[PDB]
Curated annotation (Swiss-Prot):
GO biological process, one term: defense response
Keywords, sorted A to Z: Antimicrobial, Disulfide bond, Secreted
Species per Swiss-Prot/TrEMBL record: Hirudo medicinalis (Medicinal leech)
Disulfide topology: 2-9, 24-28, 31-73, 39-47, 57-59
Coiled coil residues, start to end: none
Protein name, entry field: Theromacin
Any single Gene Ontology cellular-component annotation: extracellular region
Length: 75
């Protein structure tokens, strides 16, 4: 139940702050030039916003390595 990054590709809980929790589809898209991100949440936790754990995603069909060309890839 850690929704914020899980929300990157799941339009439900529109929230983001600081790190932005861009970890999933947003990050995989531009950085590893993946096809999509799998926005799942850490099921072991149920955390209500400002989820400092909620950086968890698979970059599907990631075509590149960690890349720096995008400001949203700076992390």
């Amino acid at each position: 139940g850690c929704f914020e990054d899980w929300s990157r590709c799941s339009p439900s809980t529109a929230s983001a702050t600081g790190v932005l929790w861009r970890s999933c589809d947003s990050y995989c898209k531009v950085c590893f030039k993946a096809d999509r991100g799998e926005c799942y949440d850490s099921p072991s936790l149920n955390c209500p916003h400002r989820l400092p754990n909620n950086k968890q995603c698979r970059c599907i069909n990631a075509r590149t390595a960690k890349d720096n060309r995008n400001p949203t890839c700076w992390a």
